[PDB]
């Protein structure tokens with residue numbers, strides 16, 4: 089097997105660590121990040137949330153506009169549950185494909201209940217004499233996001 | 244009993260409301276106005292449909308560029324992110340690509356890792372080893 | 384990460400000169416990447432209506 093431009097597969101060789109060393113290394117790394125959470129060294133967190141059929145990027149003091157009516161009194165404090173991502177300058181927690189409740193918590197307040205600005209929808213047809221004009225008004229809900237807290241427990 | 248239409252003024256006003264910013268004679272003459280306004284609304288509603296594919300195109304491009312920076316192509320990145328059971332929007336993904344470059348390079352490292360794990364698994368020709376990122380979690 | 388507003392703005396949209404050596408390259412494969420970098424399609428901040436795109440020097 090001499091070297092010809094073909095006989096050698098065109099890509100870098102794959103170096104894959106042993107599962108044992110990886111289990112140790114993981115236990116250790118998770119341990120360390122865990123020490124950062126316990127310490128309180130995370131400056132500001134941002135989260136990726138799944139709400140009302142969309143995904144969002146959320147941080148404390150921020151604002152989002154949800155496209156349908158929720159049944160909540162105005163000013164109540166909601167706790168969002170399905171959480172995809174959590175991240176901070178030094179570290180990031182990734183859910184498969186969801187983050188466990190005990191690990192992280194994100195609490196928002198509903199600010200505004202509104203009807204959306206009129207959306208003009210009109211179908212038309214060439215010389216069939218067909219027009220249909222309809223104006224749409226959509227109930228909307230604005231959320232202030234208050235807090236993202238992250239608990240020490242990670243194993 | 245002869246009747247005439249007294250309020251014709253507001254009838255015209257209602258279609259000229261929408262016609263003010265057009266160029267030329269469409270913003271005055273009621274005919275030209277009526278037609279150009281119907282055109283305008285039709286394209287309004289078609290645009291509603293388009294702008295979802297436009298935004299998604301934009302996102303895919305930004306994900307492609309962000310992925311290229313770390314030396315990984317778009318299909319590789321997306322597939323492997325999925326095979327790791329991480330479900331993220333292309334919207335959320337492109338936003339991570341811009342406003343959190345660190346996290347995003349973390350993701351690209353993850354995907355690349357998972358992929359090499361794949362090549363090694365499939366070329367290895369044995370059923371036993373589960374790459375640490377190849378395990379599949381069933382929810383409880 | 385903490386910059387004033389005007390300098391953050393400036394840093395993000397900076398035009399960056401690229402050099403690309405040509406000798407013995409198929410002119411098509413050259414123009415492929417030359418075009419990508421020209422158009423701004425390597426920048427995650429890219430948009431069609433932004434002026435962003437970078438110089439390209441082919442030698």
Ligand SMILES: [Mg+2]
Pocket residue numbers: 244245
């Ligand atoms: Mg009379």
Ligand SMILES: [Mg+2]
Pocket residue numbers: none
């Ligand atoms: Mg639809």
